[PDB]
Design a protein around this ligand. Structure first.
Ligand SMILES: [Ca+2]
Ligand SMILES: [Ca+2]
Ligand SMILES: [Ca+2]
Ligand SMILES: [Cl-]
Ligand SMILES: [Cl-]
Ligand SMILES: [Cl-]
Ligand SMILES: [Cl-]
Ligand SMILES: [Zn+2]
Ligand SMILES: [Zn+2]
Ligand SMILES: [Zn+2]
Ligand SMILES: [Zn+2]
Ligand SMILES: [Zn+2]
Ligand SMILES: [Zn+2]
Ligand SMILES: [Zn+2]
Length: 316
């Protein structure tokens, strides 16, 4: 809509207060004109029809419980936009400042969130397994990174390529969580998963085996479930990324950590320049080594640490 850019105030899913960019035209709308071609948040009204109605509010204050998932979807889309622009010089998910649209209150008791090719979609969860999924910044950024992948490498969502696709989304979901300084960790989905249970998550990047996921190529899942293990085998790559950043000793291989910024630069270059739709784990290693070589030089510690980390998880 056309109107005056304003700043409202609201509370997110976890009860935290934040300012959000809105647009005034009789009502205040969840329309952020400050980022690219805009960030737009919609009410799906518990239907499965998309996108629903552009979110309208009478007083620019968003403290109702019904408001909370919209506040966080809107705010965390903006944080993700800022991360890709400020850190990687990428303008929105397509690199051409495409508008980011999100719908909240999708369906009823729906324990999922997804990028559907043109917008974000968030369920509210069932209140036991999940609370509204836009409350997790790493979830938001994970799903928006699938859009980045679709517009660059085009990794297909099965077998090793699909596990890479998932791991890329976990890596940048985590780097956005650190960028925002929003209770950062190397776990995925901890802020919205099992509200009754403290200290768990959907999966761990620092210790995938904590939840039974593989942390070495020799332990990879080889069956047909989960599209060939896309959420299971991602642990192999997630552990390598953790080692590249933080260092450690894993299956007897010592890795010198190089930190989070260089992790992000190496993987962003690999994704945007070198990966293809059917890249496998071995090709990811080659792409990451070449990216580190491009950025830091063939004899650098950065290249040596990438090699060490992939050796540690058994990927040659
Ligand atoms: Ca209000
Ligand atoms: Ca996390
Ligand atoms: Ca929990
Ligand atoms: Cl560990
Ligand atoms: Cl371990
Ligand atoms: Cl470690
Ligand atoms: Cl170990
Ligand atoms: Zn997803
Ligand atoms: Zn995913
Ligand atoms: Zn966290
Ligand atoms: Zn798992
Ligand atoms: Zn899965
Ligand atoms: Zn280990
Ligand atoms: Zn370890």
């Amino acid at each position: 809509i056309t109107g005056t850019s304003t700043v409202g105030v609201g509370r997110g899913v976890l009860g935290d207060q934040k300012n959000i960019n809105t647009t005034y035209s009789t009502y205040y709308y969840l329309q952020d004109n400050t980022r690219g071609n805009g960030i737009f948040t919609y009410d799906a009204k518990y239907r499965t029809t998309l996108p629903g109605s552009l979110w309208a509010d009478a007083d620019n204050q968003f403290f109702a419980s019904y408001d909370a998932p919209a506040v966080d979807a809107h705010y965390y889309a903006g944080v993700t936009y800022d991360y890709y622009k400020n850190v990687h010089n990428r303008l929105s998910y397509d690199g051409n400042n495409a508008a980011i649209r999100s719908s909240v209150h999708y369906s009823q008791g729906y324990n999922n969130a997804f990028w559907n090719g043109s917008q974000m979609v968030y369920g509210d969860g069932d209140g036991q397994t999940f609370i509204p999924l836009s409350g997790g910044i790493d979830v938001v950024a994970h799903e928006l990174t699938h859009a980045v992948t679709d517009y660059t490498a085009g990794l297909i969502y099965q077998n090793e390529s699909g596990a890479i696709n998932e791991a890329i989304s976990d890596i940048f979901g985590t780097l956005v969580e650190f960028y925002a300084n929003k209770n950062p960790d190397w776990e995925i989905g901890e802020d919205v998963y099992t509200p009754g249970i403290s200290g768990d998550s959907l999966r761990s990047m620092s210790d995938p085996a904590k939840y039974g996921d593989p942390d070495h190529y020799s332990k990879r899942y080889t069956g047909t479930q989960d599209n060939g293990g896309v959420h299971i085998n991602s642990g192999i790559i997630n552990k390598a990324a953790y080692l590249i950043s933080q260092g450690g000793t894993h299956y007897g291989v010592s890795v010198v950590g190089i930190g989070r910024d260089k992790l992000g630069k190496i993987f962003y270059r690999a994704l945007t320049q070198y990966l293809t739709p059917t890249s496998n784990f071995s090709q990811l290693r080659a792409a990451a080594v070449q990216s580190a070589t491009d950025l830091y030089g063939s004899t650098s510690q950065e290249v040596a640490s990438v090699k060490q980390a992939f050796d540690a998880v058994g990927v040659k």
